[PDB]
Structure of Carbonic anhydrase 2:
Amino acid sequence: GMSHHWGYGKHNGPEHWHKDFPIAKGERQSPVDIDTHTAKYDPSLKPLSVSYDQATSLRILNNGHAFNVEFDDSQDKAVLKGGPLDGTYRLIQFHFHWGSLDGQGSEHTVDKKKYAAELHLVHWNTKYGDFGKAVQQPDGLAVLGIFLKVGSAKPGLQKVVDVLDSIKTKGKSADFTNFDPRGLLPESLDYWTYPGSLTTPPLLECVTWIVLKEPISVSSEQVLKFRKLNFNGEGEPEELMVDNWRPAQPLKNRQIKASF
Ligand SMILES: NS(=O)(=O)c1ccc(NC(=O)CN2CCN(C(c3ccccc3)c3ccccc3)CC2)cc1
Ligand SMILES: [Zn+2]
């Protein structure tokens, strides 16, 4: 926490993380490259169930590595279930990873293809009581990943783009209520799924990854605003918050299953 020094620079980036977080070379690390020809269709997978109609956002925060739109998860609202999941998972926050250029930015790749960005909607398994206890369990979290490509703008993302001006640097936060995450979902819920981990330190292996096949389109201007954010705090040398993505990690002993 208070003494972490990892980041995405040349001296503290992904290839350095293993020194302070040995699990970086673990057996179920994320992200991974999704080889579409080797992912096997699994007819037993159930349709994914995303129920965000009662989601209630609270705030948006620049934490030095990305910006998180946080939700009030004190009640049974905004749940992800079905798909490969057993039980119900509650939405706590979402954030993105993006590049310095449209040609890169996503964490997961598809047949080695890198998207301009990737949205992560983070949920914790309610059987563990809260997020803190859930991250210590192999099936503690379910993260819904959605790729972003540059093209037509995503109307639903604009409130996010506009508030970024108020949280330019590390540690800044701004009230951000009534933001509807359903505005960030593609039409189809077809997905790939596999067991993995948090993609940033502590890199805990507590995530069931659900990655949607259909990317959403955002405009060049929308992602350009993401790139104006800073990794640094106010009054420190300006380092643009870009390329805050971890590269694909060894699949090792895992199978990626397709819902289609
Ligand atoms: N991109 S991703 O894979 O979608 C991703 C999503 C959420 C996260 N969230 C976190 O990393 C939040 N931290 C909060 C602090 N946690 C610590 C901790 C908790 C309480 C007090 C002090 C530290 C933690 C470390 C080790 C075990 C359990 C908790 C680790 C998880 C990271 C990556
Ligand atoms: Zn993430």
Residues 95, 97, 120, 199 surround zinc ion (ligand 2) (CB under 6 Å). Residues 1-260 form one domain. Residues 156 and 183 are 4 Å apart (CA to CA).
